[PDB]
Amino acid sequence: NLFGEPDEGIVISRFGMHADVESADGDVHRCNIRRTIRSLVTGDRVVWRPGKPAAEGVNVKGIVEAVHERTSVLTRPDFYDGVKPIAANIDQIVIVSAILPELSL
RNA sequence: GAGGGCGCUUACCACUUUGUGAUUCAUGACUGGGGUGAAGUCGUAACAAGGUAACCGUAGGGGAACCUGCGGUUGGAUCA
Numbered sequence: 001n002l003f004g005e006p007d008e009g010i011v012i013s014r015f016g017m018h019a020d021v022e023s024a025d026g027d028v029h030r031c032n033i034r035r036t037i038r039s040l041v042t043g044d045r046v047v048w049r050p051g052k053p054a055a056e057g058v059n060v061k062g063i064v065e066a067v068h069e070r071t072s073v074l075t076r077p078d079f080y081d082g083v084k085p086i087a088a089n090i091d092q093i094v095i096v097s098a099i100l101p102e103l104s105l
Numbered sequence: 106g107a108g109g110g111c112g113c114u115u116a117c118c119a120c121u122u123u124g125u126g127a128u129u130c131a132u133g134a135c136u137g138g139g140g141u142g143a144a145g146u147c148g149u150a151a152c153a154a155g156g157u158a159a160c161c162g163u164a165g166g167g168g169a170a171c172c173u174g175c176g177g178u179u180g181g182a183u184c185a
């Protein structure tokens with residue numbers, strides 16, 4: 001409760017119980033997520049509110065309320081896990097490989 | 106004179122000092138795990154004969170669940 005300003009920002013990473021949310025200028029600010037969110041991936045623009053600082057200048061987390069629509073999505077299914085999206089909202093993929101340990105085709 | 110007092114000295118001895126142990130708390134860089142986490146990643150181990158029967162003890166291997174070797178058990182299916 002006691003949430004802040006609704007704004008648009010880019011989610012840095014995913015940690016299950018919470019996520020790292022970059023603001024509109026480059027501020028690393030970790031936030032937890034809303035219970036009704038079906039999925040949240042790396043680099044997905046969201047609507048979020050950065051809580052409220054209990055101490056003056058010292059805040060713990062905010063919340064991520066809503067998730068914007070997906071431009072692209074990287075969904076890969078799995079045995080006994082179902083279809084899980086990995087990342088979203090991307091224009092280019094770079095397949096990176098190495099000769100060691102193997103280079104398959 | 107007898108005797109007493111003062112004073113001095115000795116014995117006992119608190120406090121105190123050094124050397125060096127035992128014990129306890131606070132702090133402590135660092136470090137060992139373990140627990141709590143519904144949606145994160147990695148895999149599919151076990152529960153059916155769970156797709157190499159599983160488990161216990163021990164040795165070795167490797168991100169990991171685990172795997173191999175030896176021995177034992179049925180808390181194993183199917184089997185005469």
Ligand SMILES: [Mg+2]
Nearest residue numbers: 149150151155
């Ligand atoms: Mg298995």
Ligand SMILES: [Mg+2]
Nearest residue numbers: 151155158159
């Ligand atoms: Mg098995």
Ligand SMILES: [Mg+2]
Nearest residue numbers: 160176177178
């Ligand atoms: Mg055996």
